[PDB]
């Protein structure tokens, strides 16, 4: 096959101009959509705060308007997804992974209004979900919408434009362009066959989508952690231990979300009114925990700088962890539109710091800072649960800007993804696409 | 296929333990080899310098001891490749990519002693070539050595163990683990068909190889640039122009490297004694300029901190640039063992700084620093010539640690890879492997 090889190589990266230009337009619209989605959920979040002060008299009334304001917003999002777009529930990354293997449709005329406005209710009400979920699936569907509007065709045009929309969606959700491209390369491209996702076109759409969000958010970072200390060579063994712990917890947590999808389903059996009334109960729980104990609820980005700086007690860290594991399952396994990706960053650092605090006082000769194991654990639950370790560490590094910790972050990532494999776990997103493709057949 | 997929997805990332253990072994041996290669080249670096001190009065004698000391060392490298391992000349990256597409043999019993000891003479004599070439092909050959010693087989055992050795070789050559992995997936994987390069095994070998490089190199960085300024949004258009300049120069330089391979062959027609005596003449050439004008010669890491800080005059920058492109071709196209990758980092920074100095004095309202366009151009010729922009951008960032410049680095990198394609350029590594497989199978 050298004959085909010699001039395949002589024709490499020959992306058609039509695809890369339309990759630019896709990224532009994904960025604007992500910006509007971000500003919308923020506007609702403080509408709920401003309500809490016209009600700061009656502490019972105050816990009432907190619950119901979030319940209504939650019920709204559950309704619009079970009524107009069943595949816009949960993360949406597994559905975009199905689409890239040509095994799920991208109904952009339905999920884009549903996922946008539906996610606004779930995230604006203060549930434990990430915006990445919405923004990736929104961005993918936007990729096919302009595929269709201009009805370009070829396998690559469909696969590329759908990939760059998803990469632009992840980038804009974290201000992390490099992670957006790596996510497509490592996790969401079809993983058992060759495809011609044009990487340079994914590049273009990521650039324009990241320009669009910095037009409306510069000078402020999602998480600022400062410059932490370095990691001596004789301390690296401690990060491998931390990864081993994540490697054993990763699958265990993956089984809980999947099993909780089943347990929560039997409560409503599948009915739209019963389902939407339980989504209002979980939405009101988090709007209430949103004022009785903020660390229990919300996306969790606020607590990451606090935990890294060692400003939490070990008691509070243990409370937050088990609380946030409950709240995280109860929101994501319920089917609410919203990601699991960002909440596991919060769970990763909080356990990271706890491992850091024990290490610092078992080894005073190491002169440790708990924050360094916070940064290393941040992407560790992603590595053990999602098993996209290269995205997690480059994303964490994109958000924390402490390159001097790349070796410990790498070591804790692979220890997590090694023990997740050796304890019989599977990549969560692939396990959810599998169960989705299984019931699309068991009905025959 | 729906059924085949469902049991592919539920059976994903399950690399056999035998491969992961042997990935740990190859990375360990690649690291030790790369460190030993690095210390050797440095030991010859001052052995040759200390000779310059017992001779520093007689100015004719000293320009003599410079030429001869480097000519002999060069002749020692040209000889060892032309007589015992012809495929260990030049870079060796494309030969290692041929092996991964099952299109070239990896004769580790011959290439490991040849390129190691051959490169010592070529790089230790001060020619403008990089360690990347040797360490990746050396590292790949070690992957096949442990692939044979313990007689593992299966397509992946052959492909992964050879891939991780190559990634471990790039990582150890730049202290850039993330770039090592990105290089395999983006550029060095077979790029037109599915393959089983286990990413988790590449991870293992990369960490072990750079842990070994940090046991013998910590506290000192290859390139230290300080923290440069940020890049305002109204300045990004200037980086797009800079990429456009790199995008049209990229291919022009690619024609020169290829054409100079032809021109250099006709002087020696191909038999070993005329060839190595011409390798000694340019090997002595660069050993003389190594101190009549050091910036013209050597790997080029020396000038980059100097060029970034604007400590070069614009007259000299163009001198160094036009000198260094001359020096670069005649050393790499000669067939000497050594990479072109690192020399083009130097050329990228020298061209960036020149564009930056012009920008600083056409736009005082932008409050610019020339260094930011040095950092953005550093990886731009990599993107225009090699067309591995994601590796180039993550490698430059791993070595200079100015994350705040990610967008300008991304924009000029894509501007480079955009115009290189639209002006009829080709990925250099693919274009030379093509020409290697073309004459072997056409005029056999």
């Amino acid at each position: 096959r050298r004959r085909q090889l010699i001039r395949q190589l002589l024709e490499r990266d020959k992306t058609p101009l039509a695809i890369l230009f339309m990759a630019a337009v896709v990224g532009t619209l994904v960025g604007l959509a992500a910006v509007a989605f971000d500003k919308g959920v923020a506007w609702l979040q403080n509408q709920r705060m401003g309500a809490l002060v016209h009600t700061a008299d009656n502490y019972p009334l105050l816990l009432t308007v907190a619950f119901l304001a979030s319940a209504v917003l939650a019920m709204f999002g559950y309704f619009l997804v079970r009524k107009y777009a069943p595949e816009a529930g949960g993360s949406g990354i597994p559905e975009i992974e199905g689409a890239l293997e040509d095994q799920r449709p991208v109904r952009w005329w339905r999920v884009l209004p549903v996922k946008f406005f539906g996610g606004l209710g779930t995230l604006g009400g203060g549930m434990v979900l990430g915006r990445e979920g919405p923004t990736v699936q929104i961005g993918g569907n936007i990729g096919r919408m302009v595929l269709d509007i201009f009805r370009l065709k070829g396998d690559e045009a469909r696969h590329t434009l759908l990939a760059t929309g998803a990469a632009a969606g992840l980038a804009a959700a974290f201000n992390a362009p490099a992670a957006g491209i790596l996510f497509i390369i490592e996790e969401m491209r079809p993983q058992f066959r060759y495809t011609l996702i044009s990487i340079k076109a994914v590049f273009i759409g990521v650039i324009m989508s990241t320009i669009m969000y910095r037009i409306f958010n510069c000078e402020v970072a999602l998480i600022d952690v400062g410059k932490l200390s370095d990691a001596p060579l004789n301390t690296l063994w401690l990060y491998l231990i931390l990864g081993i712990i994540f490697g054993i917890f990763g699958p265990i947590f993956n089984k809980w979300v999947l099993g909780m999808q089943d347990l929560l389903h039997r409560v409503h059996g599948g009915n739209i009114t019963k389902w939407v009334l339980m989504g209002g109960a979980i939405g009101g729980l988090c709007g209430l925990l949103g004022f009785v104990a903020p660390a229990t609820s919300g996306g969790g980005f606020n607590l990451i700088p606090i935990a890294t700086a060692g400003n939490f007690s070990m008691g509070m860290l243990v409370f937050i962890f088990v609380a946030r594991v409950i709240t995280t399952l109860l929101c994501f396994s319920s089917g609410a539109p919203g990601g699991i990706f960002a909440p596991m960053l919060a769970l990763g650092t909080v356990l990271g710091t706890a491992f850091g605090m024990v290490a610092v006082e078992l080894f005073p000769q190491y002169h440790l800072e708990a924050g360094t194991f916070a940064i290393a654990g941040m992407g560790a639950l992603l590595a053990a649960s999602i098993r996209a370790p290269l995205t997690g560490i480059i994303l964490v590094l994109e958000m924390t800007d402490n390159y001097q910790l790349i070796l410990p972050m790498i070591i804790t990532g692979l220890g997590a993804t090694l023990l997740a494999q050796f304890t019989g776990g599977k990549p969560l997103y692939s396990a959810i696409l599998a169960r989705t493709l299984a019931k699309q057949e068991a009905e025959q | 296929r729906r059924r085949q997929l469902i049991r592919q997805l539920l059976e994903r990332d399950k690399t056999p333990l035998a491969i992961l253990f042997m990935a740990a072994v190859v990375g360990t041996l690649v690291g030790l080899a790369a460190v030993a290669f690095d210390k050797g080249v440095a030991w010859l670096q001052n052995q040759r310098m200390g000779a310059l001190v017992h001779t520093a009065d007689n100015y004719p004698l000293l320009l003599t001891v410079a030429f001869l000391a480097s000519a002999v060392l060069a002749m020692f490298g040209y000889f060892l490749v032309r007589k015992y391992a012809p495929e260990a000349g030049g870079s060796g990256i494309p030969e290692i990519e041929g092996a991964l597409e099952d299109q070239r043999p990896v004769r580790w019993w011959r290439v490991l002693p040849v390129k190691f000891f051959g490169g010592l003479g070529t790089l230790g004599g001060g020619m403008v070539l990089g360690r990347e070439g040797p360490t990746v092909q050396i590292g790949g050959n070690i992957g096949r050595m442990v692939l044979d010693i313990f007689r593992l087989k299966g397509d992946e055992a052959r492909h992964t163990l050879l891939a991780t050795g190559a990634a471990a070789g790039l990582a150890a050559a730049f202290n850039a683990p993330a770039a090592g992995i990105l290089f395999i997936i983006e550029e060095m994987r077979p790029q037109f068909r599915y393959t089983l390069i286990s990413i988790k095994a590449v991870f293992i070998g990369v960490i072990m190889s750079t842990i070994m490089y940090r046991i013998f190199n910590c506290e000192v960085a290859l390139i230290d640039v300080g923290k440069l300024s940020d890049a305002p949004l109204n300045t990004l258009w200037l980086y797009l122009i800079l990429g456009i300049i790199f995008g049209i120069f990229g291919p022009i330089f690619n024609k020169w490297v290829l054409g100079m391979q032809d021109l250099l062959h006709r002087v020696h027609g191909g038999n070993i004694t005329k060839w190595v005596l011409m390798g000694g003449a340019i090997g002595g050439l660069c050993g003389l300029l190594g101190f009549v004008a050091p910036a013209t010669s050597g790997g080029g890491f020396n000038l980059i901190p100097i060029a970034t800080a604007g400590n070069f005059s614009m007259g000299m920058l163009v001198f160094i640039f036009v000198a260094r492109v001359i020096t670069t071709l005649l050393c790499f196209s000669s067939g000497a063992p050594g990479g072109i990758f690192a020399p083009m980092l130097a050329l990228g920074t020298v061209l960036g700084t020149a564009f930056g100095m012009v920008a600083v004095e056409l736009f005082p309202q932008y409050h610019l620093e020339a260094g930011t366009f040095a950092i953005a151009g550093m990886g731009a010729l990599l993107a225009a010539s090699i067309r591995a922009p994601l590796t180039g951008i993550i490698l430059v960032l791993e070595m200079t640690d100015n994350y705040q410049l990610i967008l300008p680095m991304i924009i000029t990198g894509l501007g480079a890879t955009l115009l290189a394609q639209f002006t009829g350029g080709k990925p250099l590594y693919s274009a030379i492997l093509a020409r290697t497989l073309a004459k072997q199978e056409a005029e056999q």
Partner: antibody, heavy 121, light 107 residues
Framework: EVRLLESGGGLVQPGGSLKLSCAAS????????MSWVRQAPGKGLKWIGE????????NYTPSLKDKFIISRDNAKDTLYLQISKVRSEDTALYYC??????????????WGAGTTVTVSS | DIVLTQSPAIMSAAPGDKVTMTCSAS?????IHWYQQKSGTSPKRWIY???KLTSGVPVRFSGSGSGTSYSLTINTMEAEDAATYYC?????????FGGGTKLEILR
Amino acid sequence: EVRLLESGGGLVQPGGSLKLSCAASGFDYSRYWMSWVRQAPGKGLKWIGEINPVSSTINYTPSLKDKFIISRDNAKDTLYLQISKVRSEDTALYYCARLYYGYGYWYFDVWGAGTTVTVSS
Amino acid sequence: DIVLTQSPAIMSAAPGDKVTMTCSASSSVSYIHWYQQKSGTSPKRWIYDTSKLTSGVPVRFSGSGSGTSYSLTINTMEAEDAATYYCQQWSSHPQTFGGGTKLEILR
């Protein structure tokens, strides 16, 4: 240069207290752990304690609660050490040292000249 | 704490001759550092992590050892080598110095 200049040492009565100071120059005084170490007249070096850059962790030699108080102010570039209820055993030359490491087994990188403390009535 | 006692508290050696002092531990230690102190001057980091020399320390100096016994030597001793050498540990906490070996010129 890298320079540490200790000051504040001299003659104080038994049972009194003192406050030694160490002025750092020629390096980022933050980012570094600082440490005190004393040498009794004609004896060995003995470690007092150490302080991190952000004063979050402070360790002392095994020696009773608030006898020593190590503190820093990264703004004015100096490190401090208070000794309380001082007795004649605290008569020593007091060294201020910048900490660092190679493989990760920490050493006392750079020292100052020292100040002598004499405890006598 | 871990006690490190150094071998010859006092001793003398002629110039151009090989010296050797020893540091030994109550438990077993890792990566020992050595400091040279002349009278009137601050201690200077000399040899660290068992055998690596600080920038400036002449190559006549060298360190070695394992677990519980370590040493500094000078192949051919010079006059400027006259000082007191303290071994130091931080393998375990808290760190401890050796009693020191004074080593002066013989004539």
